Amino acid sequence: SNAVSITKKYTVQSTGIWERIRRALVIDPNRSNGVPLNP
Amino acid sequence: SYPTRTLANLRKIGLKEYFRQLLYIGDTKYGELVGVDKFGNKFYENKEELPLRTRWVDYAKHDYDA
Amino acid sequence: PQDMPPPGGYEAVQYKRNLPSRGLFRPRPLLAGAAVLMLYGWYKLVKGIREQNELAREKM
Amino acid sequence: MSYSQTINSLVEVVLVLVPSLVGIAYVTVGERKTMGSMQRRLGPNAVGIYGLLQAFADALKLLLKEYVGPTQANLVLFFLGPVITLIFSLLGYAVIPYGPGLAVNDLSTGILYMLAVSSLATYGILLAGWSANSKYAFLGSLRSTAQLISYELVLSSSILLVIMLSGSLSLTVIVESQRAIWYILPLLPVFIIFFIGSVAETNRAPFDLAEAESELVSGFMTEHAAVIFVFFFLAEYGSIVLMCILTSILFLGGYLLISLLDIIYNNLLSWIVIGKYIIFIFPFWGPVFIDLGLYEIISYLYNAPTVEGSFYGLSLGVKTSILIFVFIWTRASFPRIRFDQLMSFCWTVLLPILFALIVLVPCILYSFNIFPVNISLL
Amino acid sequence: ALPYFDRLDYVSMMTNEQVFSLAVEKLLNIEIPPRAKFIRTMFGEITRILNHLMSVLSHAMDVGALTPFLWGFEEREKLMEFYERVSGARLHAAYVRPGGVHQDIPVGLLDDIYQWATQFGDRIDETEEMLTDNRIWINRLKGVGVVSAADALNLSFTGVMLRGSGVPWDVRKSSPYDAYDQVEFDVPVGINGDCYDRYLCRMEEFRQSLRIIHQCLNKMPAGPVRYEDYKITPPPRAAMKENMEALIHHFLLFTKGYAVPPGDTYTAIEAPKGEMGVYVVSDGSERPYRVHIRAPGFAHLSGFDHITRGHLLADAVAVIGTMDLVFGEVDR
Amino acid sequence: VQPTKFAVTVRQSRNWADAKQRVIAAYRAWIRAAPEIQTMYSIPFPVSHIRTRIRQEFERHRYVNKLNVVDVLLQQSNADFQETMNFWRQQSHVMAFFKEEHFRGEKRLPSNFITGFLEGRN
Amino acid sequence: ATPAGPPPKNFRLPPPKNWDEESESTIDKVGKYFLMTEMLRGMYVLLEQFFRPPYTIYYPFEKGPISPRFRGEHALRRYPSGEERCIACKLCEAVCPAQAITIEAEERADGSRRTTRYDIDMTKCIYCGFCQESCPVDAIVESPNAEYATETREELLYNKEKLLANGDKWEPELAAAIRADAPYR
Amino acid sequence: MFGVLFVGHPDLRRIMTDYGFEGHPLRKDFPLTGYTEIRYDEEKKRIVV
Amino acid sequence: QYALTTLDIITNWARQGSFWPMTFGLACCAVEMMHLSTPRYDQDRLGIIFRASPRQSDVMIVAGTLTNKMAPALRQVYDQMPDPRWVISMGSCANGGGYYHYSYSVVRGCDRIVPVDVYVPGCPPTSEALMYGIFQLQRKMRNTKITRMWYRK
């Protein structure tokens, strides 16, 4: 599709059990949440 | 905030300090003391918060002002 | 130096319409679901009002 | 009876009105907090420790505000008008049952009572809009009245379909009849129409464009009248909460909790008189529940009049709150509909479907011998 | 007089000052350096995104959708941090000036715009989740405010008001300026000339402006960001404090100003609200003899009667928002 | 009056017979309208004071013998008439045409030499 | 409406499709009408936001980001010695876009060229920063201070006694912002 | 803004200036700050010129 | 004395907790007042709700350049605000005319038309700056003696 993977999107990521939960109950798993990265 | 975050910070700052923050800032927040102003204000930092929230101030006066 | 791009250039960003169809909102799975819910409910109602009518025979 | 009726009358009326009023105050705080999480911000979080005092300061501020509305040529109307709009808002709560028969008035015609108090709502939107002086805005109060009467037919005609299934207009009987099944399951499309009709009836967004356009044509000479009055705000929030409780009474369980005590009976088969309470299940073992300490105490508390009543009202409360969420979620999800388009929705889509279902439902109840008895059972 | 242009269309600041700089630069007969050309085309598209976030989301806030407005104003809140890093203003930068830009961009900004870039499409997609296929949204913009292609031209319509009726025309493609001839982008052109077409054309420009900003990041050349001539642009502070000629040129530029040769020019750019142009008469002196601003919204509001005729008032509020209208632009 | 209630398409007087016809029709409309101007703008003056003051504003240009000058003076009147008969002018603009509602009043130039000398040029 | 020369390849639209030529099954078409599926998707996107972190800042305890180039309230600075940097050139008075600066100078008792008046109308100023770009001695700057709402606008007529007091107050932060941005100036 | 008069125009009225405004501001003889200013008069209860 | 003071503190607590501003977004400063309603700075968290009507409002925020044509409608809207009334002047244009101070069409300060209680500087003030001005006004109300002034006379 037109999407690129979330892992290259420079936003805070969900981790672990919450990542699996997010990648299940969400329209587009590749969508970011717009929260920037502190470091 | 969210329960995981607010629970952990109670385990750090204690219930007397938890109520102090609810009266002023309105958030439960924990961080390292960075220094004190001449006016008595105290500054805290935490790289692990949401962006633009890594630095905050605990004012010395009750009728605080920026 | 100046503010310049990285040597190889920045990577491409996502800019086209993504908007991916999900099964949760397609009409066929929802039509089938709503139908099975109303059929299960209509079986449960047809059993209950029969029992209610029989409880009324005992009351009378 | 053990004590005097007037005392009993007073305690039940205070026990319904003071929780209902405190709840109507927290729906206003809740609608600003919920819309902020969906809009990635915060709701009120400063007036009070968690913003839990926001409703209080808003209400006391308005009470202390000057009111400059016309007192000329109409003194009673300016003052005694909106007061009974608030009475017509709270008068519907007197037929809500918080458990079997646990209502202020247990009324056999309870449904026709809440259809009467609802037709009085049209006066509190008609008359208030009569105060404002601006030609286009006055016609916007008539258009809001036209929306209410049209979406009242939606509600009354779809309440009719529940009465066919229950056989009664008593809210207690209507809930007790759902012990077999919640009416959302067999009357799915009737429930959706009722909820959509219930948003349009409350004048809530996305059906509020008629009353919305008043603020855009006010001009440079005149202004509104709902200004310092908390009445038409408590009348509004209390009608939303009341449309959520009635929606739960009719289609969700009402106060019916799906009881797990039935499930444990089916699964458990190794009853032991020694208090072991062994279970014939694959994750089961020999429990060490204390007969002297826990089982004797737990059994008594389950049958307490306070505990069982508590769960019946926590059930109705949890269900009303879920619907209060769906009203707030609806306002935050959609744009507004034009008045002609909402009118087309009611008159050329919804009502045709409802009158089609008015034919079909009693036809099926006759075909499966399922007409209920209309005598006092249940 | 350059700060006056920030305050014309106050949601699209660096493109207002771009058309004034391009007009003065044309009478100056100067060529501005490549780096400022790319800086200006990058911040002209950051500006176009900023304006469309105001215009599209305020339009839907009038129509009654209130949530996309708040989501994209965080996107607006992030993109004004880049204004305040190059200049020190969240709104009125005064950054674009005749001869290039006032100051070089700071040394970590092109990385921070790229980090914003990686996620901005997801913001358009979720804003698009709420409006594009929504039937209430569709039934409030279809057939509303319909202008024919012949009438849009005869009515002085530019931009998406011109482009939504099926006329393929963008000043960037037809009279290229700055680094626009160096970037690949597409032009959304509608069919039915209505508000729904103009909403769909504006959303497509979100994705096209993002596609330009990424290209500008990869072609950012090095060199002066300011025309290399101290009779026109101010010398560096370090030169003014060390070299005689530089302090003289510094002193005269801040008191008298530079002289512009005589003549007049009409210069237009593809502003976010339509075509924005300025007519500048020069008298060969250091002050403009006459400045006239052509504002796209002024011509759009003039055709409001011809377009809203026979419509409902709830229809007219939709027509007001589809015409990108900031009244400081209309009244100059 | 196609676009607005009192709009008149800009016309150029053909000759003095035409130009005087238009002036008289302009004056007639204004002094007709004076009761309507005095209620809307709540002018605390008699309709007679309004009409006599309308007359002064025509009496200023009674000696214009240029036809190109009359048309601009007629267009100015028509436009003033349109913005007054539509409630577009504020009471502040209208009752500021009367030059006695200044806190110095109508007497704002010095009367003669000596009184303006003792007051420093008024 | 199209450019001169040959019309664009397939500029003209295809002929419209009749209702029965459309490619959408009645089942899909009727289901999307009655179930309101596209509206359901949008309501689901708001649930996704509900469970995402908010953007909000608790002010005044947490502040938003400001660059070294920020343009706040004016200040008059000194040298390390303690002498005022200002020598009354009046360049900042000439370049003011809004004529907000009024300067009167003369010879000081010791013979030095120094201002006697230095007024800035904070209600005329547009905070452009031009005054500080034109300085040859870094004498006038704009501090990062944006929090100084006052009660009366007489408090917004800064005279030379207030602008020097501001520089004394804000000097560490002024020197720091100058240190960051000087290479670019 | 200039006083130029356009023969044939329907509804040639002012577009920018205030309602009783006298003068043409883009004329070069017109002064930058104009000839009049407004304020609120407490004694007259309105805005005066 | 305590009793009348308590009546003041409660009254001032509610004038502070519910802070509903009527607004005249004349120009750009209104954009910055819109960024006070967005997620980064939300007004709702402090109780601020902008109301359209003057009858429902507490404070007027003049944000933008006031022109001679706009001034009659400014005074009309302020004249319709029920008491108690506060006005905030936001930005250089409303405060003293600003960039357009030497023009024939601009009122040089909105306080030639209405009374003002706080002046917020900047063109435009940052959103924090307008927040700072609201806190100054909220502090002015906390120091408002209502029933303690009636007691001295």
Ligand SMILES: *P(=O)(O)OCC(C)(C)[C@H](O)C(=O)NCCC(=O)NCCSC(=O)CCCCCCCCCCCCC
């Ligand atoms: P008789 O034949 O003696 O005189 C007829 C005229 C006057 C036509 C002369 O014969 C004549 O030729 N004079 C020269 C032509 C002339 O009068 N030119 C000017 C005509 S237009 C004009 O005078 C407009 C005046 C102002 C219009 C507005 C007046 C009212 C405004 C304020 C009203 C009160 C506040 C709202």
Ligand SMILES: CCCCCCCCCCCCO[C@@H]1O[C@H](CO)[C@@H](O[C@H]2O[C@H](CO)[C@@H](O)[C@H](O)[C@H]2O)[C@H](O)[C@H]1O
């Ligand atoms: C306690 C009994 C009742 C007494 C009166 C209580 C106060 C009643 C009014 C407040 C209740 C909520 O009322 C609602 O508030 C929100 C702000 O949170 C307003 O919302 C407004 O600001 C938000 C801010 O993000 C915008 O998204 C929205 O577009 C705008 O309209 C609504 O316009 C108003 O209808």
Ligand SMILES: CCCCCCCCCCCCO[C@@H]1O[C@H](CO)[C@@H](O[C@H]2O[C@H](CO)[C@@H](O)[C@H](O)[C@H]2O)[C@H](O)[C@H]1O
């Ligand atoms: C079908 C069975 C129905 C059973 C339940 C019936 C409940 C009837 C309660 C009526 C109480 C008054 O009804 C309610 O009045 C208020 C005030 O006039 C209205 O509220 C009105 O004013 C408020 C502001 O104060 C606005 O935000 C709102 O948009 C407007 O419509 C509601 O639109 C109306 O729903």
Ligand code: SF4
């Ligand atoms: S502050 Fe600088 S520019 Fe202004 S008068 Fe002093 S030396 Fe000159």
Ligand code: SF4
């Ligand atoms: S920032 Fe203010 S004082 Fe300085 S030059 Fe600009 S307008 Fe004048």
Ligand code: SF4
């Ligand atoms: S003060 Fe500045 S930002 Fe505000 S309206 Fe005036 S010019 Fe615009």
